[PDB]
């Protein structure tokens, strides 16, 4: 019964045709179970290792290499040469690399925390119902509760279903529903209907929600919904349904794979256009089984040339290091890819209570009467420092610290706050921080009178453990609390009867101490306390009182106020009915007003400056709270989201207000409003979706269950360290130290990481660009010499990998937090850099293919002189022309080493070319990245151990002496620096000119 909250208890009982006294009959339970299922949330296992690994290989660039792995086995079947028996390793090499790049992906998916599992911690195993078969209450499994049966809850219980309250047995029922509102303050339910169909949870004061827990009371209700249909179940579905998109750079890599499967698959099928050479390339034969292999021989190589294999190995070690660095800045990053996505954060969404605020109620201000002379009234207003439940902070008057004992009015104010109070302050010794016991509102009063120290107790050298209640205990000594008139909704106050118990028995006078909502409490005050004396409450006096209350209840310091009053002559205890709470208001009559305390859940101190740093970095901060719009707006102005006098009508909304906008208007409201309050969890989810409809990389910061749907929908969920298990489970990063500042720290880290990532991606691709140029040129020449499919992998995996990874340690930009967030949808290579790598690509593609032709054209030892070299496939048959040379020499060791030597040296230089884009090396020192110089040496160190340690050069081929070969590797390997330099000089100076 969804719209139960808007219907009457009788109506809700009629809906399921159930008596409030008997409950559901056995058959009803049978039918309701069949119709509504079981009261539980469906679990979500997710991972099937088989289905997950088959998801790993559905990537295109691995599907092609996989395709290129089996095709390479076909290149192991020919029996033409003795080397073939050792050439079976070549498909095996590529396969185990596809396995390495596959394990590491699984290595990152293993730590999938189960959000639903964390969330299902909030469903109790048991539940108390009333059914027809028994008069006594039955304690049953909560999953066996159907809509429509009478349910019972009391203190401590975890609400088992979404329940419409029928009868409240206590004078009040008080519920903790932070699960759905993120607010720990206990809310006082009733049973009257809540007519608004579109009411949010915060307005459904006649409902109990599955997952929330009873802070106080005992009530009876009827189940409205169970299972998936409850409010917590809507949190569940959204958590299951939110599928995480891919990283902006992973998106850029995927479009690179699609275009690769285009240009490659259209090159190999365009070679057929130049089969003019295979018209009579045999002496009399044609194309057969052995001869058409050359078309797939150039296909398996063209694939490994374009694929930047080993790049994922580079980026993965890069991210793991950043994870460590951010973990030192107290940013614990659970997902490796979100390290980079963090750098382009456009908009940070943030919860208020517990995220931006300490979630510890604090008394900011207090006032007592100062003087009353006729129509003139003055007050002693004070303020109190400290943003937590600790008894730390001092009272001050006009920004100057003050001791409250000198104000007789403040002594009685502390006495009421300590005695009219069902709550205490515990120092959790394990956490090392003071915690509350009972209501936050009341603990605020406890922690207050500890700061005040009205009797000047020596509290400096106490133990932190018994500092907690040290000053309250002194007040408990002065007056014995006899009984309590509990809070009731009719009077919005509570009071406490007391006796002195020392000097001469109770011959000093019994007294009642009262706190509550100001208006109602003040109206029952006939006198006013001025220090020790009392005077009659008059028109001018109370207006002065109300006035300053109104000023505090609103505006820049929107506080909750409690009026504090005493009854100096309380009725005789034996003429007071303590059962009927309807009688308690007349007992709290003819009172002496004392003072007023103004309460607030204050901001964390690190916030306001963190916000400004986000502002300086072009990052918008949007508060999204389930707390009242008044309070949120008030916090935004201290935080600096809003200015102190800034007009906010158009830029703060409640969820209900937001739902009332046309869909169009809702999307732009997200673009201009920085405050959303009194929201249900789906709202935060929906607001992030709207911000992502502007292609804005958005984060979400929270600490509660109610934050989880948005924590998932955001590109980045950020969980408070002290936050809930379910919020951390849903987040990509956790703030270990609860510092909102460490978000700014993490952005600057991920910002500087994404910049270095672009480099070694460009550097790896610019290599693949030239490597593809190399193979295509060889095929057009008819010369397959000077390149091997197996050689390409090793170089990309190691020779290019190590400088690539070294480019990850580049010194970051100085004014890096002064730039706006990176645009999401621009390519790494686009305009002149395309030309720069397209030229340098073909220029290093021809330096490798030209390395063969030179060896055949001219060499001191190699080889001596011509064109028939292109027709080397005819050394076998047409031998009379190939005179003076053996036929085996065309696959000689030396020419392939040169093309590898220039490929290594060039890429050793293009690595320096990619130390920076568009800045000289004479101005950007290669030694500014000491790691980069290390990588270049170790890559060539492996290249000199690749040529001089027998097994390696056996595959790869012989090495040729320095004096006659290293002369020629520097034909382009060093001009490619000059070339890139010159092209770099152009885009830097000729651009603006």
Ligand X SMILES: Nc1ncnc2c1ncn2[C@@H]1O[C@H](COP(=O)(O)OP(=O)(O)CP(=O)(O)O)[C@H]2OC3(O[C@H]21)C([N+](=O)[O-])=CC(=[N+]([O-])O)C=C3[N+](=O)[O-]
Ligand Y SMILES: C/C=C(/C)C(=O)O[C@H]1C(C)=C2[C@H]([C@@H]1OC(=O)CCCCCCC)[C@@](C)(OC(C)=O)C[C@H](OC(=O)CCC)[C@@]1(O)[C@H]2OC(=O)[C@@]1(C)O
Enzyme catalytic residues: 351
Residue 199: is it exposed, middle or buried by C-beta count within 10 angstroms (0-12/13-18/19+)? middle
Minimum distance from CB of 991 to Cl ion (Å)? 54
3-state secondary structure of 677: strand
Residue length, the chain? 993
Q: Which of 256, 382, 754, 843 binds ligand Y (CB under 6 A)?
A: 256
Size of interface with Mg ion, in residues (CB under 5 A): 7
Query: What single DSSP character describes residue 124?
Result: -
Closer residue to ligand X in complex, CB, 181/226: 181
909 bridge partner residues = none
Instruction: List the binding residues for Mg(2+).
Output: 351, 353, 703
Closer residue to K ion in complex, CB, 528/679: 679
Interface with Mg ion by CB under 5 A: which range of 352-360, 549-557, 731-739, 814-822?
A: 352-360
**Residue 704 touches Mg ion, criterion: CB under 5 A:** yes
Chain centroid to CA 693: how far?
A: 18
Closer residue to Mg ion in complex, CB, 704/750: 704
**Residue 838 touches ligand Y, criterion: CB under 6 A:** yes
Instruction: List the binding residues.
Output: 304-305, 307, 309, 351, 353, 442, 489, 515, 560, 625-627, 678, 684, 703, 706, 768, 771, 796, 799-800, 907
Q: Which of 86, 250, 259, 473 binds ligand Y (CB under 6 A)?
A: 259
208 bridge partner residues = 163
Minimum distance from CB of 722 to ligand X (Å)? 20
Q: Which residues bind ligand X (CB under 6 A)?
A: 185-188, 361, 439, 441-442, 487, 492-494, 515-517, 560, 599, 628, 631
Closer residue to ligand X in complex, CB, 265/628: 628
Answer yes or no: are the C-beta atoms of 513 and 420 closer than 8 Å: yes
Phi, psi for 348 (deg, rounded to 5): -95, 120
Question: CA 946 to CA 355: how far, in whole Å?
Answer: 56
Minimum distance from CB of 93 to Mg ion (Å)? 53
Side-chain half-sphere exposure of 192, counting CA atoms within 13 A:
6
Minimum distance from CB of 672 to K ion (Å)? 24
Instruction: List the binding residues for Ca(2+).
Output: 304-305, 307, 309, 768, 771, 796, 799-800, 907
Nearest residue to 434 (alpha-carbon basis) of 366, 382, 385, 361:
361
Question: CA 902 to CA 868: how far, in whole Å?
Answer: 25
Q: Which of 393, 603, 841, 895 binds ligand Y (CB under 6 A)?
A: 841
Task: Select the binding partner of residue 353 from Cl ion, ligand X, Mg ion, none (C-beta < 5 to 8 A, by kind).
Answer: Mg ion
Closer residue to K ion in complex, CB, 354/709: 709
Task: Select the binding partner of residue 492 from K ion, ligand X, Mg ion, none (C-beta < 5 to 8 A, by kind).
Answer: ligand X
**Residue 629 touches Cl ion, criterion: CB under 5 A:** yes
Size of interface with K ion, in residues (CB under 5 A): 3
Nearest residue to 381 (alpha-carbon basis) of 356, 359, 364, 358:
364
* Interaction mask 670-709, Cl ion, x per CB under 5 A: --------x-------------------------------
Query: What single DSSP character describes residue 881?
Result: T
Q: Where are the alpha helices (H) located in 783-831, listed in sequence order?
A: 789-794, 801-806
Question: CA 117 to CA 465: how far, in whole Å?
Answer: 36
Task: Select the binding partner of residue 494 from ligand X, K ion, ligand Y, none (C-beta < 5 to 8 A, by kind).
Answer: ligand X
Q: Which of 351, 732, 738, 748 binds Mg ion (CB under 5 A)?
A: 351
Q: CB under 8 Å to 404, separation ≥6 — which residues? A: 382, 395, 410, 411, 414, 452, 453, 454
Minimum distance from CB of 332 to ligand Y (Å)? 29
**Residue 183 touches Mg ion, criterion: CB under 5 A:** no
Q: CB under 8 Å to 241, separation ≥6 — which residues? A: none
Task: Select the binding partner of residue 441 from ligand Y, Mg ion, ligand X, none (C-beta < 5 to 8 A, by kind).
Answer: ligand X
Minimum distance from CB of 248 to K ion (Å)? 14
**Residue 628 touches Cl ion, criterion: CB under 5 A:** yes
Chain centroid to CA 573: how far?
A: 58
Q: Which of 768, 799, 810, 910 binds ligand Y (CB under 6 A)?
A: 768
Minimum distance from CB of 694 to K ion (Å)? 17
**Residue 843 touches ligand Y, criterion: CB under 6 A:** no
Closer residue to K ion in complex, CB, 714/903: 714
Side-chain half-sphere exposure of 631, counting CA atoms within 13 A:
23
Residues 711-730 close enough to bind K ion by CB under 5 A: 712, 714, 717
Task: Select the binding partner of residue 837 from ligand Y, Cl ion, Mg ion, none (C-beta < 5 to 8 A, by kind).
Answer: ligand Y
Minimum distance from CB of 834 to ligand Y (Å)? 5
Task: Select the binding partner of residue 560 from ligand X, K ion, Cl ion, none (C-beta < 5 to 8 A, by kind).
Answer: ligand X
Answer yes or no: are the C-beta atoms of 775 and 838 closer than 8 Å: no
Interface with ligand Y by CB under 6 A: which range of 192-200, 685-693, 763-771, 796-804?
A: 763-771
Q: Which of 129, 594, 761, 896 binds ligand Y (CB under 6 A)?
A: 761
Question: CA 183 to CA 176: how far, in whole Å?
Answer: 8
Instruction: List the binding residues for ATP.
Output: 353, 442, 489, 515, 560, 625-627, 678, 684, 706
Q: Which of 628, 874, 916, 918 binds Mg ion (CB under 5 A)?
A: 628
Long-range contacts of 651-654, Cβ-Cβ distance < 8 Å, separation of 24 or more: 651/675, 652/676, 652/677, 653/629, 653/677, 654/629, 654/678, 654/679
Chain centroid to CA 677: how far?
A: 20
**Residue 457 touches Cl ion, criterion: CB under 5 A:** no
331 bridge partner residues = 735
Q: Which of 144, 703, 771, 785 binds Mg ion (CB under 5 A)?
A: 703
Question: CA 755 to CA 495: how far, in whole Å?
Answer: 64
Interface with K ion by CB under 5 A: which range of 165-173, 405-413, 708-716, 790-798?
A: 708-716
Phi, psi for 873 (deg, rounded to 5): -65, -10
Closer residue to ligand X in complex, CB, 340/439: 439
Interface with Cl ion by CB under 5 A: which range of 123-131, 483-491, 624-632, 917-925?
A: 624-632
Q: Which of 91, 343, 354, 603 binds Mg ion (CB under 5 A)?
A: 354
Task: Select the binding partner of residue 717 from ligand Y, Mg ion, K ion, none (C-beta < 5 to 8 A, by kind).
Answer: K ion
Q: Which of 106, 263, 396, 577 binds ligand Y (CB under 6 A)?
A: 263
Q: DSSP characters for 149-212?
A: -EEEEETTPBP-SEEEEEEE-SS--EEE-HHHHS--SPEE---S----TT--GGG-TTEE-BTB
Question: CA 447 to CA 137: how far, in whole Å?
Answer: 41
**Residue 554 touches ligand Y, criterion: CB under 6 A:** no
Question: CA 478 to CA 496: how far, in whole Å?
Answer: 14
Minimum distance from CB of 760 to Mg ion (Å)? 40
Q: CB under 8 Å to 9, separation ≥6 — which residues? A: 20, 164, 165, 166, 167, 191, 222
Closer residue to Cl ion in complex, CB, 630/934: 630
Q: CB under 8 Å to 591, separation ≥6 — which residues? A: 514, 521, 524, 525, 526, 527, 565, 566, 567
Cα-based distances in Å from 784 to 271, 306, 853, 871, 891:
14, 17, 11, 11, 9
The percent of the chain in helix, strand and coil, each rounded to the nearest 5, is: 50, 15, 35
Answer yes or no: are the C-beta atoms of 861 and 964 closer than 8 Å: yes
In the chain, what is the straight-line distance between the N-terminal and C-terminal CA atoms, in Å?
Answer: 73
Task: Select the binding partner of residue 841 from Cl ion, ligand Y, ligand X, none (C-beta < 5 to 8 A, by kind).
Answer: ligand Y
List contacts with Mg ion (CB under 5 A): 182, 351, 353-354, 628, 703-704
List contacts with ligand Y (CB under 6 A): 252-253, 255-256, 259-260, 263, 306, 761, 765-766, 768-769, 772-773, 776, 827-829, 834, 837-838, 841
List contacts with K ion (CB under 5 A): 712, 714, 717
């Amino acid at each position: 019964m969804e719209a139960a909250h808007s219907k009457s208890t009788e109506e809700c009982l009629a809906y399921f045709g159930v008596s409030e006294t008997t409950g559901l009959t056995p058959d009803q339970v049978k039918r309701h179970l069949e119709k509504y299922g079981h009261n539980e949330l469906p679990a979500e296992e997710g991972k099937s290792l088989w289905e997950l690994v088959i998801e790993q290989f559905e990537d295109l660039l691995v599907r092609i290499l996989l395709l290129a792995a089996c095709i390479s086995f076909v290149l192991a079947w020919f029996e033409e040469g003795e080397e073939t028996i050792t050439a079976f390793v070549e498909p095996f090499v590529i396969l185990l690399i596809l396995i390495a790049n596959a394990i590491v992906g699984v290595w990152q998916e293993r730590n999938a925390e189960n959000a639903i599992e964390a969330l299902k911690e909030y469903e109790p195993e048991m539940g108390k119902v009333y059914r027809a078969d028994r008069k006594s209450v039955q304690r049953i499994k909560a999953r066996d509760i159907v809509p429509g049966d009478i349910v019972e809850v009391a203190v401590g219980d975890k609400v088992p279903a979404d329940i419409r309250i029928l009868s409240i047995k206590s004078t009040t029922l008080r519920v903790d529903q932070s699960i759905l509102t993120g607010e720990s303050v206990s809310v006082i339910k009733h049973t009257e209907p809540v007519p608004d169909p579109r009411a949010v949870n915060q307005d459904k004061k006649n409902m109990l929600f599955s997952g929330t827990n009873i802070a106080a009371g005992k009530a009876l209700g009827i189940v409205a919904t169970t299972g998936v249909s409850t409010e917590i179940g809507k949190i569940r579905d959204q958590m299951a349904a939110t599928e995480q998109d891919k990283t902006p750079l992973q998106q850029k890599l995927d479009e690179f794979g699609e275009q690769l499967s285009k240009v490659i698959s259209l090159i190999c099928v365009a070679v057929w256009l130049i089969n003019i050479g295979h018209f009579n390339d045999p002496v009399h034969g044609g194309s057969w089984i052995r001869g058409a292999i050359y078309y797939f021989k150039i296909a398996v190589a063209l694939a490994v040339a374009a694929i930047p294999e080993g790049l994922p190995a580079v980026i993965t070690t890069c991210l793991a290091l950043g994870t460590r660095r951010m973990a030192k800045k107290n940013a614990i990053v659970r997902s490796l890819p979100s390290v980079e996505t963090l750098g382009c954060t456009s908009v940070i969404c943030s919860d208020k209570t517990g995220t931006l605020t300490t979630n510890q109620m604090s008394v900011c201000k207090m006032f007592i009467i100062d003087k009353v002379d006729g129509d003139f009234c003055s007050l002693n207003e004070f303020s109190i420092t400290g943003s937590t439940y600790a008894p730390e902070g001092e009272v001050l008057k006009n920004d100057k610290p003050i001791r409250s004992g000198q104000f007789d009015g403040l002594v009685e104010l502390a006495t009421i706050c300590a005695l009219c109070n069902d709550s205490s302050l515990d120092f959790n010794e394990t956490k090392g921080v003071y915690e509350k016991v009972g209501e936050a509102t009341e603990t605020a009063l406890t922690t207050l009178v500890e700061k005040m120290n009205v009797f000047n107790t020596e509290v400096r050298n106490l133990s932190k453990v018994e500092r907690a209640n040290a000053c309250n205990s002194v007040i408990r000594q002065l007056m014995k609390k006899e009984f309590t008139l509990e809070f009731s909704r009719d009077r919005k106050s509570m009071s406490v009867y007391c006796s002195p118990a020392k000097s001469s028995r109770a011959a000093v006078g019994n007294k009642m101490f009262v706190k509550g909502a100001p208006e109602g409490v003040i109206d029952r005050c006939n006198y006013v306390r001025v220090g020790t004396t009392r005077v009659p409450m008059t028109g001018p006096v109370k207006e002065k009182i109300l006035s300053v209350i109104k000023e505090w209840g609103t505006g820049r310091d929107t506080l909750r106020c409690l009026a504090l009053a005493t009854r100096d002559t309380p009725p005789k205890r034996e003429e007071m009915v303590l059962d009927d709470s309807s009688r308690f208001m007349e007992y709290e009559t003819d009172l002496t007003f004392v003072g007023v305390v103004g309460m607030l859940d204050p901001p964390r101190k690190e916030v306001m400056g963190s916000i400004q740093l986000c502002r300086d970095a072009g990052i918008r901060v949007i508060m999204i709270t389930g707390d009242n719009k008044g309070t949120a707006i008030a916090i935004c102005r201290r935080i600096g989201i809003f200015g102190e006098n800034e007009e906010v009508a158009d830029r703060a909304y409640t969820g209900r207000e937001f739902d009332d906008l046309p869909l169009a208007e809702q999307r732009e409201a997200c673009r201009r409003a920085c405050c959303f309050a009194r929201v249900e969890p789906s709202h935060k989810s929906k607001i992030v979706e709207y911000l992502q409809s502007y292609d804005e990389i958005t984060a979400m910061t929270g600490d509660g269950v109610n934050d989880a749907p948005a924590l998932k929908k955001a590109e980045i969920g950020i969980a408070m360290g002290s936050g809930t298990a379910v919020a951390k489970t849903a987040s990509e990063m956790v703030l270990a130290d609860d510092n909102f500042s460490t978000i700014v720290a993490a952005v600057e880290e991920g910002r500087a990481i994404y910049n270095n990532m672009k480099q070694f991606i460009r550097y790896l691709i610019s290599s693949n660009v030239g490597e593809v140029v190399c193979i295509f040129l060889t095929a057009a020449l008819g010369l397959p010499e000077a390149l091997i499919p197996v050689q390409l992998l090793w170089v990309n995996l190691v020779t290019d990998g190590l400088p690539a990874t070294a480019l990850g340690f580049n010194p970051p930009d100085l004014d890096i937090m002064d730039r706006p967030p990176r645009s999401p949808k621009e390519p790494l290579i686009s305009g002149w850099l395309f030309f720069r790598y397209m030229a340098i690509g073909g220029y290093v593609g021809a330096a490798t293919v030209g390395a063969a032709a030179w060896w055949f054209m001219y060499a001191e030892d190699g080889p001596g002189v011509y064109h028939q070299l292109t027709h080397f496939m005819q050394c076998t048959e047409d031998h009379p022309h190939f005179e003076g040379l053996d036929c085996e020499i065309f696959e000689a060791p030396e020419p392939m080493t040169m093309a590898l030597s220039v490929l290594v040296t060039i890429e050793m230089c293009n690595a320096l070319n990619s130390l920076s884009e568009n800045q000289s090396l004479m101005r950007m020192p290669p030694w500014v990245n000491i790691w980069l110089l290390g990588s270049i040496c170790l890559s060539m160190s492996l290249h000199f151990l690749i040529l001089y340690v027998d097994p390696l050069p056996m595959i790869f081929k012989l090495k040729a002496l320095d004096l006659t070969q290293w002369l020629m590797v520097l034909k382009i390997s060093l001009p490619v620096i000059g070339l890139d330099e010159i092209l770099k000089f152009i885009a830097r100076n000729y651009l603006e000119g």
